Amino acid sequence: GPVWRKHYITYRINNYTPDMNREDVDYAIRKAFQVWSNVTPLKFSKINTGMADILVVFARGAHGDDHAFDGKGGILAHAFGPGSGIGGDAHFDEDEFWTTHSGGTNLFLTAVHEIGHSLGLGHSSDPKAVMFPTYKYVDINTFRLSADDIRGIQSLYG
């Protein structure tokens, strides 16, 4: 489907979850973008004002799209593929408890997956892939994309 047709991509953090330290949200999101810039020609920059390609939002329940959140558990996050407006945006359910670690729901791991969607990836049927639709914590310090994830993204970029 749709892909970004340019190499310099911007993101903006709309608002911050109270679940985490501000600096930890910034770093988790930055690291998640880095996972994908590692394996593509894309470059990501955080902007603090204006219209970004990818808007990162924390919200609960109904939040202005057709995809209301469902309280704690179930749907953790969702995102929209490349395009104008809502295209590229990544939304995280504030009814989850976001963390830097194995507790609650890990923001970095979830963001890697969601940014995958923001870049145009769909779901994998392979449980080993970060793009598998089910959340399962893995050690974030040693995290690596699966072969399936790399094949997927390199079918779109580079």
Cα–Cα dist 25/7, whole Å: 24
Nearest to 77 by CA among 125, 131, 27: 131
Choose the contact partner of 109 out of Ca ion, Zn ion, ligand HS3, none; CB within 5 to 8 A by kind: ligand HS3
Q: Give residue 32's identity as a one-letter amino acid code.
A: A
Residues 16-55 that bind Ca ion (CB under 5 A): 19
Q: Quick one: 7 or 73, whose CB is closer to Zn ion?
A: 73
From 26-34, 41-49, 57-65, 108-116, span contacting ligand HS3 (CB under 6 A): 108-116
Strand partners, 12: 55
Query: Interface mask (CB under 5 A) for Zn ion, residues 83-102, using x and -?
Result: --------x-----------
Q: Was 73 annotated as part of a binding site?
A: yes
Count, in order, helices (H) and strands (E) of the chain: 3, 7
Q: Was 93 annotated as part of a binding site?
A: yes
Binding-site size, Ca ion (CB under 5 A): 9
Cα–Cα dist 130/116, whole Å: 9
Are 106 and 100 contacting, i.e. CB atoms less than 8 angstroms apart? yes
Cα–Cα dist 23/27, whole Å: 6
Residue nearest to Zn ion (CB): 91
Does residue 67 belong to the site contacting Zn ion (CB under 5 A)? yes
In angstroms and rounded to an integer, the radius of gyration of the C-alpha atoms of the chain is 14
Residues 36-95 that bind ligand HS3 (CB under 6 A): 75-79
Q: Was 91 annotated as part of a binding site?
A: yes
Cα–Cα dist 62/117, whole Å: 21
> Is 114 one of the annotated active-site residues of the chain?
yes
Residues contributing to the annotated binding site for Zn(2+) = 63, 65, 78, 91, 113, 117, 123
Please give the residue ranges that form the binding site for Ca ion (CB under 5 A). Answer: 19, 70, 74-75, 87-89, 93-94
Please give the residue ranges that form the binding site for Zn ion (CB under 5 A). Answer: 65, 67, 91
- Where in the sequence numbering do the catalytic residues fall? 114
